[PDB]
Write a protein that binds this ligand. Structure first.
Ligand code: K3M
Ligand code: CL
Ligand code: MG
Ligand code: MG
Ligand code: MG
Ligand code: MG
Lengths: 194, 194
C-alpha cells in the first residue's frame, strides 16, 4: 500500500545527508518524513558490517569479543561489536573479517552472514550485515592479537564470557561512564532469556 | 583521553538535526565528525523498544513484532514495538503504552535496560530496551485492540521465540522486508546460547 513519492535533498555533508521524504500513507494521503542517509553507499548490499566474534579456546568458556571506542556523536565511549563500512566492491564477509582483524587483531572464520538489517529505520536508511565469525584462539595467529587501527581509529578490545555477558556488561556500565550498544545489549539479553 | 570541543549546527529540521562535531583524538590532534541528533530529547533516552514475550499455555512462547512502512528505508521493516518517550514519562510507562498502541497487548514489565545506543558512529540516538511479558490467556489480551496514533499503520507479527531466527529469514526471503538489527541480534543469540 505505501511508497515513496519523492526524496528532496535538504543538506549534504561529506558523510551524511538529510532528506525530506514524501510518501503515500495507506489511507491514500501524502505525508512527509525527515530522513537520514549516508553519502558513501555505492553498490554495497548494505552500508556496513557488524561482527559477532565468538572466541573459542580449549578449556575456556566461549567469549564474545567487543570493542570500546570514543564516538563523537555520542560524546563519549561506547561498547559495540567490531564494525565498519563496507568498501566499494568488497563482500560483507571480507569486510567483516577485515574489520575484525583491524579492530581486534584476531583472524576469524566466517560462520554466518545475515541479510541487510536496519539500524534505526524511523530515522535513517542505514543498514548492515551482521556477520557471525568464530575465532580459533588456540591458533598461533590469534595468540598475541594486536589491532591494526586505521587513521583516527583508537580501539580497545574487551572479551567477555558468553555465559555471563549481560552481567559483565552491567558491571562495566556500573564502573564508568560508557554506553552499551543496542545490538550488543539485545544479544546479551537473548543469551539470558535462552 | 578523548572529548568534544565544539558542536556546530549544520541543519535543523522539525525532528532531526545534523551537526559537525569537533573532538580531540587521543594523539592530541583535533578532528571533526558529522553527527545526527534528534531535536525531541528532554528523558533518559530518546525512545523505548519493547521485547514482548507472549505467553500462552500449551502454545510456544512468541515474540511479538511489528511491521510498518518506514519512509527513510523506502520499504517495510520488521521491528520490536517502539516509540519515543513522552516528556515526563518513565521508560517503563512508555514501553507499556507503546506496546498497547502498536499491538493491543497489555503486558507486565520484566526488566529495563540502561540507555543503549542505536548507531553511535552516526547519531546520539538512544533507547531503553524493555522486556515485557504478556499473559495471552488473560481476557484483556483475548482480542488485543491496537490504537494507532495519527499516521501510524502497524501490522502485528508474532513469531515463536524457539525458532525466531529461521522464521525471520523466511519472511525476508518471501516478503522482501528488512528486519531490524536489534531484532536480528536477539534472534541470533537465541540460537547461539548454550
Ligand atoms: C514521531 C516522528 C515523526 C516523524 C519523524 C521524522 N524523522 O520525520 C520522527 F523522527 C518522529
Ligand atoms: Cl522474559
Ligand atoms: Mg569500526
Ligand atoms: Mg574500522
Ligand atoms: Mg513505533
Ligand atoms: Mg506508537
Amino acid at each position: 500500500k505505501q511508497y515513496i513519492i519523492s526524496e528532496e535533498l535538504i543538506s549534504e555533508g561529506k558523510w551524511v545527508k538529510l532528506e525530506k521524504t514524501t510518501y503515500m500513507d495507506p489511507t491514500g494521503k501524502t505525508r512527509t518524513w525527515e530522513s537520514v542517509k549516508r553519502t558513501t553507499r555505492k553498490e554495497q548490499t548494505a552500508d556496513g558490517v557488524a561482527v559477532i566474534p565468538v572466541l573459542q579456546r580449549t578449556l575456556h568458556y566461549e567469549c564474545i569479543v567487543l570493542v570500546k571506542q570514543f564516538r563523537p556523536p555520542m560524546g563519549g565511549y561506547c561498547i559495540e561489536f567490531p564494525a565498519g563500512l563496507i568498501d566499494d566492491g568488497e563482500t560483507p564477509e571480507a569486510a567483516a573479517l577485515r574489520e575484525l582483524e583491524e579492530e581486534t587483531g584476531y583472524k576469524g572464520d566466517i560462520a554466518e552472514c545475515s541479510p541487510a538489517v536496519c539500524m534505526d529505520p524511523g530515522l535513517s536508511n542505514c543498514t548492515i550485515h551482521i556477520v557471525t565469525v568464530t575465532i580459533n584462539g588456540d591458533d598461533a595467529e590469534n595468540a598475541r592479537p594486536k589491532p591494526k587501527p586505521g587513521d583516527g581509529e583508537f580501539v580497545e578490545v574487551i572479551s567477555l564470557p558468553k555465559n555471563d555477558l549481560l552481567q559483565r556488561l552491567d558491571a562495566l556500565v556500573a564502573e564508568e561512564h560508557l554506553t552499551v550498544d543496542a545490538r550488543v545489549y539485545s544479544y546479551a539479553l537473548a543469551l539470558k532469556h535462552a
